[PDB]
Design a protein around this ligand. Structure first.
Ligand SMILES: NC(=O)c1ccc[n+]([C@@H]2O[C@H](COP(=O)([O-])OP(=O)(O)OC[C@H]3O[C@@H](n4cnc5c(N)ncnc54)[C@H](O)[C@@H]3O)[C@@H](O)[C@H]2O)c1
Ligand SMILES: O=C(O)[C@]1(O)C[C@H](CP(=O)(O)O)[C@@H](O)[C@H](O)C1
Ligand SMILES: [Cl-]
Ligand SMILES: [Cl-]
Ligand SMILES: [Cl-]
Ligand SMILES: [Cl-]
Ligand SMILES: [Cl-]
Ligand SMILES: [Zn+2]
Length: 353
């Protein structure tokens, strides 16, 4: 499946298929130099496959910390200064081989090096089906997730589904949060169409039919980022369950997708309090449990603390916290939520556990 952005100009292709790794060849041959920024762990799993391309040496490897460890200024400055010592040209390319963390970090590097160089997205995670699309890139700050970054369109997005076969369940859970999130944004018939498929851990962990739902998430996103690239409108909906997700993630250092799931439930609880949406909270929580989501940690969730991180959410305004809420399927709204409401939403979510 080959998709592609449809902006007035400067568009990129999104190759999503098994073995898509074959498309990298053409690109590598078009650049003066290329820097393969690869995840520390991902490096171990696939170093072999790269030892070849890393022979013609105008192609270099840059091993970075795995996961969130890489999204920091220090790693950013270190990496930038390192590449620059190669006397690079503007016709260089930063190839991000890894998950959203690698993509975000390497993307920010591509976006700033000489004010901008070529950027190839090489997603290796399920979750990365969401992150490798949209041009949003960046690193974290002491005040929270993704506070420094940019909107930088990659040159291409090469998604070789074979990469998924090696994902442990923890990652399958983390990455499913995004897939599911896209189902929620696609309405009731879509949300149940996926709950009836990935009913339990057995099916999820098998990844059967995951491809279908991944392409579905990528399509749901492509349209949203093409319609509202700089997130001035509907793209904000993609942040569903991220106001609390990002707060829980940064403070508790748990997997990104896991945090999103907690935030989604939180988002529902808030919706019930503000609109009396009658969201079956027990329904959503049962589904997580069955999928294998830990969710024990929350037993020590300090709202007072988390609120500080939510107070940095890039969705906020002068009034304060702005959340993406599902008043009900098909009816998503973006609005301010007072800390009184938010605080009760957290005390209640905690209660369930
Ligand atoms: N910019 C965006 O559009 C966007 C969208 C979604 C989420 N994100 C960001 O993306 C990150 C989360 O995504 P992620 O799950 O890909 O993070 P990640 O980069 O941390 O990858 C998860 C883990 O899987 C390992 N891994 C990578 N590919 C593997 C493979 N094929 N087999 C086995 N292990 C593999 C990694 O080493 C890592 O430990 C967060 O930093 C989040 O803020 C950004
Ligand atoms: O606009 C987007 O692409 C997102 O809303 C961007 C967020 C990250 P942000 O809120 O730090 O931009 C990402 O986690 C979400 O799944 C998709
Ligand atoms: Cl444009
Ligand atoms: Cl094209
Ligand atoms: Cl040169
Ligand atoms: Cl492979
Ligand atoms: Cl809107
Ligand atoms: Zn996310």
């Amino acid at each position: 499946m080959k998709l592609q952005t449809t902006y007035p100009s400067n568009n990129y292709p999104i190759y999503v298929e098994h073995g898509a790794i074959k498309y990298i060849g053409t690109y590598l041959n078009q650049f003066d130099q290329s820097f393969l920024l690869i995840d520390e762990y991902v490096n171990q799993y696939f170093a072999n496959k790269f030892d070849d391309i890393l022979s013609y040496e105008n192609v270099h490897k840059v091993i970075i910390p795995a996961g969130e460890k890489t999204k920091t200024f220090e790693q950013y400055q270190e990496t930038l200064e390192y590449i620059l010592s190669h006397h690079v040209t503007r016709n260089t390319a930063i190839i991000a081989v890894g998950g959203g963390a690698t993509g975000d970090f390497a993307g920010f590097v591509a976006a700033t090096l000489l004010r901008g160089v070529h950027f190839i997205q090489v997603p290796t995670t399920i979750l990365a089906h969401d992150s490798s699309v949209g041009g949003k890139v960046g690193i974290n700050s002491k005040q929270g997730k993704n506070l420094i970054g940019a909107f930088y369109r990659p040159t291409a997005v090469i998604y070789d589904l074979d990469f998924l076969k090696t994902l442990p369940f923890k990652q399958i859970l983390s990455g499913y949060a995004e897939v599911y999130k896209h189902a929620l944004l696609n309405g009731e018939s879509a949300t149940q169409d996926i709950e009836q498929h990935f009913k339990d851990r057995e099916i999820l962990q098998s990844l059967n039919g995951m491809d279908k739902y991944i392409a579905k998430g990528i399509e749901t996103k492509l349209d949203i980022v093409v319609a509202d690239e700089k997130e001035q409108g509907v793209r904000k909906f993609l942040n569903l369950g991220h106001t609390f997700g990002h707060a829980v993630e940064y403070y508790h250092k748990i997997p990104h997708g896991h945090a999103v799931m907690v935030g989604i439930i939180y988002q529902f609880i808030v919706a019930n309090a503000l609109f009396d949406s009658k969201h079956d909270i027990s329904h959503y929580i049962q589904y997580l449990i069955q999928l294998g989501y830990p969710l024990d940690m929350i037993t020590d969730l300090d709202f007072e603390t988390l609120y500080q991180y939510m107070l940095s959410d890039k969705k906020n305004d002068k009034q304060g916290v702005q959340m993406v809420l599902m008043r009900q399927f098909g009816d998503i709204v973006v609005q301010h939520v007072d800390q009184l409401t938010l605080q009760h939403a957290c005390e209640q979510l905690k209660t369930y556990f």
